[PDB]
């Protein structure tokens, strides 16, 4: 057993039929030493008395908010959560596997620039009693300050007649070096709590590898009796632009003809019912492309 945070603990269990579980001794954080009663969750049933309480934790029915009282007054709280180890593996029932870039991938992170900010999102089929706790750092031996905010619902969709709930969180590196050569990776650690169930997930990466710029800005068409295309860098991309350069790809889409350039403009051939789209990528590093920015042709 170990403490996740104040008055919150985790019990690691080997999850198998008729497993005996672990014996846990809960101590009421209180000065007084007599006339003490324990309870669980909302039930008034007195489970024991005294300074301490011994319990065998083997099923979720044995977990929950253990509370000690003395004269009706609430003295101390102690919440117990369970971490299933199924045949030597921790449980991963909460989050849906994205299977990209590889199996057993639950977290996907991105960054719109080298500023030091980035965003990580994950999916789940759960809708209630769901809580996440996010932490991050650069380096494991000696970690560096990385501040993470709160995880909140970003979208809701249906996939295979079962609802999908997307969560997202924003973080930021305390003292960033946007132009530097990242030597140590970012470490992201997530605690997931569904009811009393405890699970935690992880991801490691450099920022330069997860870059995905925003689509080009102000996409315009200038015809000529065939068409001249022009755009601008996005607002979120890093600055100055002569340092953090971008490259682009122009597509006319029946077929899809594509060209590449480092300029903010290009000339192409337009056709009826066609569409012109453009996306961007870091000019010097092969990171992720940007979503298309489109303008109907003709």
């Amino acid at each position: 057993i170990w403490e996740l945070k104040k008055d919150v603990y985790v019990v690691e269990l080997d999850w198998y039929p008729d497993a005996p579980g672990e014996m846990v001794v809960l101590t009421c954080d209180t000065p007084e030493e007599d006339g003490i009663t324990w309870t669980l969750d909302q039930s008034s049933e007195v489970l024991g008395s005294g300074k301490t309480l011994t319990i065998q934790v083997k099923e979720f029915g044995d977990a929950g908010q253990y509370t000690c009282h003395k004269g009706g007054e609430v003295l101390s709280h102690s919440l117990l959560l369970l971490h299933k180890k199924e045949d030597g593996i921790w449980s991963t029932d909460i989050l849906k596997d994205q299977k990209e870039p590889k199996n057993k991938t639950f977290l996907r992170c991105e960054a719109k620039n080298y500023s030091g900010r980035f965003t990580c999102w994950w999916l789940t089929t759960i809708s209630t009693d769901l809580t996440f706790s996010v932490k991050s750092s650069r380096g494991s031996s000696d970690p560096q300050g990385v501040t993470c905010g709160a995880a909140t619902l970003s979208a809701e969709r249906v996939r295979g007649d079962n609802k999908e709930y997307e969560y997202s969180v924003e973080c930021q590196e305390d003292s960033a070096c946007p132009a530097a050569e990242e030597s140590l990776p970012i470490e992201v650690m997530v605690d997931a709590v569904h009811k009393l169930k405890y699970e935690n997930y992880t991801s490691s990466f450099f920022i330069r590898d997860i870059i995905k710029p925003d689509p080009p800005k102000n996409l315009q068409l200038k015809p000529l009796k065939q068409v001249e295309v022009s755009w601008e860098y996005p607002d979120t991309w890093s600055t100055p632009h002569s340092y953090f350069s971008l490259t682009f790809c122009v597509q006319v889409q029946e077929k899809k003809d594509r060209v590449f350039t480092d300029k903010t403009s290009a000339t192409v051939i337009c056709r009826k019912n066609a569409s012109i789209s453009v996306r961007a990528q870091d000019r010097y590093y092969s990171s992720s492309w940007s979503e298309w920015a489109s303008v109907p042709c003709s």
Partner: antibody, heavy 115, light 112 residues
């Protein structure tokens, strides 16, 4: 006392279907996952499929993907395995094993695919 | 989509020691644990070792397991006629997570 009992096996021609049943007892069936394992006479073990505690996610071996279908009914404490488009190489004994450290195995039921 | 490598046959006289290897890769044995089973001619497999080296109840102490890097080993100290049987090692792959990886099997034979 944990116990598992397979049923539904027998003989069948190729191409036809068959449904297998593993009756559980002695523990909290709905709180654990379950496997399906087979072994040809005098050969080694080969994993077939697996299903989680809540039936949320199901997994299959690539030699039976799209053909077999696994299911459970926690209300009656049983585990199923629907085998469709059977093939000759599927001839074997089919056990149900629990998922966990101290796992348990049933007696198994024979499945013979032969014209 | 993977298998573990065990020696087909191992042999030894009563009272002697014998070892059974379970070789794999970094994806499976190098990142996961190892189980050992005992299958007697006319029954289903019985669990001998779990989490590499642990012994359940009802399994003597002579059955001792281990794991090193990409390979594991089950040691039977002090043979007996009853120990003559097939043995299988099982583990998982870091990417075919729940799928079970069984070994080739090992026929233990008592001679002398």
């Amino acid at each position: 006392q944990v116990q598992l009992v397979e049923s539904g096996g027998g003989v069948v021609q190729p191409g036809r279907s068959l449904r297998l049943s593993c009756a559980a007892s002695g523990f909290t069936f709905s709180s654990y996952g379950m496997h399906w394992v087979r072994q040809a006479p005098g050969k080694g073990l080969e994993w077939v499929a697996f299903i989680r505690y809540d039936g949320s996610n199901k997994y299959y071996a690539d030699s039976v993907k799209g053909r077999f279908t696994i299911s459970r009914d926690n209300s009656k404490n049983t585990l199923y395995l629907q085998m469709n488009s059977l093939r000759a190489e599927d001839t074997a004994v089919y056990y149900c094993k629990t998922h966990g450290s101290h796992d348990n195995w049933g007696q198994g039921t024979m499945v013979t695919v032969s014209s | 989509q993977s298998v573990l490598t065990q020696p087909p046959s191992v042999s030894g006289a009563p009272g002697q020691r014998v070892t059974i290897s379970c070789s794999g890769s970094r994806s499976n044995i190098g990142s996961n644990t190892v189980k050992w089973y005992q299958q007697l001619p006319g029954t289903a497999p019985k669990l001998l070792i779990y989490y590499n080296d642990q012994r359940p109840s009802g399994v003597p102490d002579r059955f001792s397991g281990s794991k090193s890097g990409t390979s594991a080993s089950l040691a039977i100290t002090g043979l007996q006629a009853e120990d003559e049987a097939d043995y299988y090692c099982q583990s998982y792959d870091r990417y075919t997570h729940p799928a079970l990886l069984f070994g080739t099997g090992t026929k233990v034979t008592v001679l002398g």
